[PDB]
Amino acid sequence: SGFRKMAFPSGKVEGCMVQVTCGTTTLNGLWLDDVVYCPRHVICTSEDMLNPNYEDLLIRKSNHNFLVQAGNVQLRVIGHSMQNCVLKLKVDTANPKTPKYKFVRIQPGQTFSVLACYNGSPSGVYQCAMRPNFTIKGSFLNGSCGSVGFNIDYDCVSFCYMHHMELPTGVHAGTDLEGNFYGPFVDRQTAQAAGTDTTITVNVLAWLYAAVINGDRWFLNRFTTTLNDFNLVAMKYNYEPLTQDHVDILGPLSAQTGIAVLDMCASLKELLQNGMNGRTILGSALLEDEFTPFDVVRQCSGVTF
Amino acid sequence: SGFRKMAFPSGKVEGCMVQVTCGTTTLNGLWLDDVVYCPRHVICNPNYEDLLIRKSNHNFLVQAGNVQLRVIGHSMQNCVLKLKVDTANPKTPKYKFVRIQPGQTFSVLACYNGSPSGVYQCAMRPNFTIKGSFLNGSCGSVGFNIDYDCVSFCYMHHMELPTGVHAGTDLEGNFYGPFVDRQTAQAAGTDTTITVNVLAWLYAAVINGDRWFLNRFTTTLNDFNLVAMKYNYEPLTQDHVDILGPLSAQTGIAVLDMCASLKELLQNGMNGRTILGSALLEDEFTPFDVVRQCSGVTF
Numbered sequence: 149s150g151f152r153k154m155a156f157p158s159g160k161v162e163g164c165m166v167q168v169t170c171g172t173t174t175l176n177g178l179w180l181d182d183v184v185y186c187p188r189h190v191i192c193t194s195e196d197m198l199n200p201n202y203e204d205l206l207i208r209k210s211n212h213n214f215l216v217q218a219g220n221v222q223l224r225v226i227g228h229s230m231q232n233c234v235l236k237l238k239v240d241t242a243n244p245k246t247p248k249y250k251f252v253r254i255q256p257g258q259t260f261s262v263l264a265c266y267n268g269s270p271s272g273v274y275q276c277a278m279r280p281n282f283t284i285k286g287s288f289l290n291g292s293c294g295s296v297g298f299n300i301d302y303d304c305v306s307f308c309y310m311h312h313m314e315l316p317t318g319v320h321a322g323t324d325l326e327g328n329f330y331g332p333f334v335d336r337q338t339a340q341a342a343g344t345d346t347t348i349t350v351n352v353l354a355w356l357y358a359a360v361i362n363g364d365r366w367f368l369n370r371f372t373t374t375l376n377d378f379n380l381v382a383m384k385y386n387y388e389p390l391t392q393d394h395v396d397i398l399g400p401l402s403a404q405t406g407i408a409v410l411d412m413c414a415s416l417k418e419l420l421q422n423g424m425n426g427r428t429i430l431g432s433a434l435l436e437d438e439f440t441p442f443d444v445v446r447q448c449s450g451v452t453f
Numbered sequence: 454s455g456f457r458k459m460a461f462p463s464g465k466v467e468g469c470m471v472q473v474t475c476g477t478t479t480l481n482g483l484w485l486d487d488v489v490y491c492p493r494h495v496i497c498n499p500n501y502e503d504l505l506i507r508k509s510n511h512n513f514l515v516q517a518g519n520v521q522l523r524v525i526g527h528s529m530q531n532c533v534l535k536l537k538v539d540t541a542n543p544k545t546p547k548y549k550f551v552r553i554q555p556g557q558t559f560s561v562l563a564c565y566n567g568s569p570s571g572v573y574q575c576a577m578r579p580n581f582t583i584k585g586s587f588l589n590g591s592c593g594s595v596g597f598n599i600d601y602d603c604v605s606f607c608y609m610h611h612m613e614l615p616t617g618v619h620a621g622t623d624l625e626g627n628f629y630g631p632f633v634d635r636q637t638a639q640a641a642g643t644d645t646t647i648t649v650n651v652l653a654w655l656y657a658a659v660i661n662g663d664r665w666f667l668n669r670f671t672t673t674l675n676d677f678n679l680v681a682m683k684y685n686y687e688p689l690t691q692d693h694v695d696i697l698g699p700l701s702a703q704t705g706i707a708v709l710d711m712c713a714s715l716k717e718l719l720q721n722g723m724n725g726r727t728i729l730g731s732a733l734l735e736d737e738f739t740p741f742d743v744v745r746q747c748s749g750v751t752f
């Protein structure tokens with residue numbers, strides 16, 4: 149019993165964190181085999197950030213201009229290339245602690261664990277989700293750039309995010325491990341704002357199923373809804389449209405609890421209308437949207453209370 | 454910017470998790486040097502000394518990854534069983550066994566069959582239970598903090614109470630709270646809110662640009678403690694006020710100034726507003742957790 153925002157064990161990622169220094173800038177890098185991956189803005193000053201020409205800045209650099217530190221050991225840079233917004237530093241030593249891994253690009257609504265680092269050293273780990281507006285509500289300070297997001301499915305680490313920057317509203321933006329940003333953001337100091345955020349409906353529904361599994365049914369009602377009428381109501385509360393794919397994904401939770409997806413949709417409709425009236429669901433006074441249907445099956449029991 | 458319930462990096466603890474099997478029971482153990490620590494109920498009104506005297510070393514199966522560890526000795530210390538093994542753990546970190554106080558927080562590395570499945574942050578509640586996320590097979594999962602490079606082990610999971618909350622011991626086998634390791638009618642006492650933690654969290658909201666709850670008013674520690682007692686809040690002591698000193702200095706808001714803001718939230722609610730994305734007053738962040746997350750301390 150119990151339900152917590154749970155992160156994946158960070159050990160396999162801690163063994164990959166290195167410190168990258170270029171001139172006066174110092175951020176984190178990901179050391180996998182003989183390559184160190186880090187944000188390409190490590191080559192920039194605060195001046196270049198207004199309109200950086202990365203190709204022109206990088207052509208002026210040599211291997212010895214980059215200092216890579218793995219623990220107390222210095223790594224020698226033997227090559228360098230840019231792939232989109234990520235700089236790939238070829239080093240002379242393969243990481244013996246390299247885990248089995250994949251670079252995956254996630255979709256908004258997907259969750260992942262974040263290993264926050266400063267100077268190549270991990271300071272903390274937390275769970276979070278890719279928001280519909282392609283930003284993450286993380287907890288990062290200056291020096292966190294190069295911190296990575298990941299999922300660990302079975303024994304393989306799936307790298308899905310590299311932290312690059314903080315937007316003016318305090319939210320964060322970054323790229324997949326190929327250097328392709330999530331969202332319409334650029335690694336430039338520009339008046340770019342996060343689009344209006346929306347609630348991840350399929351996740352709130354998954355979390356309501358987790359509450360039913362943990363013995364809480366106070367929110368259920370005798371009503372059902374059409375998929376269209378639910379979306380017409382949910383959009384009024386800034387909720388993401390629930391698609392047929394979402395309904396199909398919720399199938400196993402619906403089967404395990406005996407509550408149809410559109411019957412759960414009806415109680416979400418009522419919850420949005422009535423609020424909680426002093427009650428909580430899984431210890432929360434708000435509707436939680438950072439647990440996917442996959443996270444709920446993973447964390448909750450297979451036997452309903 | 455941003456404020457999340459953040460756990461310590463679990464890597465130094467993952468390298469210590471082993472699977473312990475005794476007969477039909479299978480739970481987790483902590484392998485430090487040549488000793489495996491696990492709940493003594495792995496051998497299970499139980500007379501533990503009488504059950505243990507009937508066991509031999511080969512009755513215990515210890516699995517570290519795919520390797521089998523050979524048990525060469527065994528002893529009991531309170532509610533924890535210490536299995537002497539033939540191999541020192543090469544991944545043993547620098548460590549200490551510490552007993553924590555209610556209100557203090559720690560990281561939990563949840564495991565099943567000697568394999569870590571997840572990590573999460575939580576606090577020792579005033580009623581000595583933890584609001585964890587555990588399933589059958591989680592017994593032997595450990596709680597820890599990291600101080601520089603040293604792992605402080607503070608909790609070993611033992612059981613789930615009927616209300617869905619959890620109970621366990623320090624690494625010396627001494628339970629937190631009036632609990633016993635056996636199947637009987639045990640209930641968690643009435644819980645209280647950790648006031649010093651809610652105050653620390655209000656300071657974190659001020660640091661992150663949330664000041665709507667601040668007012669021009671102050672209070673005496675005595676007048677606030679009456680209000681704390683009415684709302685099932687833990688009494689705020691002078692030690693708590695002294696501990697909040699650095700947060701008070703960093704934000705320019707006196708502890709009793711912040712206490713008057715909490716008094717108005719307790720008496721009147723949030724009125725549709727949230728603090729750090731929460732509609733409830735959060736009490737599982739200590740004043741040190743607030744400082745550490747709003748600075749950038751690494752291990």
Ligand SMILES: CC(C)(O)c1ccc2c(NC(=O)Cc3cccc(Cl)c3)cncc2c1
Nearest residue numbers: 197288289290292312313314335336337454
């Ligand atoms: C101090 C403060 C505001 O809390 C802070 C300050 C900086 C933070 C940060 N670094 C940057 O944004 C560097 C940067 C600058 C311009 C463009 C680009 Cl692409 C990158 C990343 N995450 C959290 C950060 C938090």
Ligand SMILES: CC(C)(O)c1ccc2c(NC(=O)Cc3cccc(Cl)c3)cncc2c1
Nearest residue numbers: 149494587588589591611612613634635636
């Ligand atoms: C099935 C369910 C509710 O998920 C569950 C069941 C058991 C759980 C568990 N173990 C026990 O409580 C076993 C037990 C019994 C009597 C005395 C003692 Cl000391 C221990 C620990 N954590 C989560 C547990 C969760």
Ligand SMILES: [Cl-]
Nearest residue numbers: 253254255258
């Ligand atoms: Cl995805």
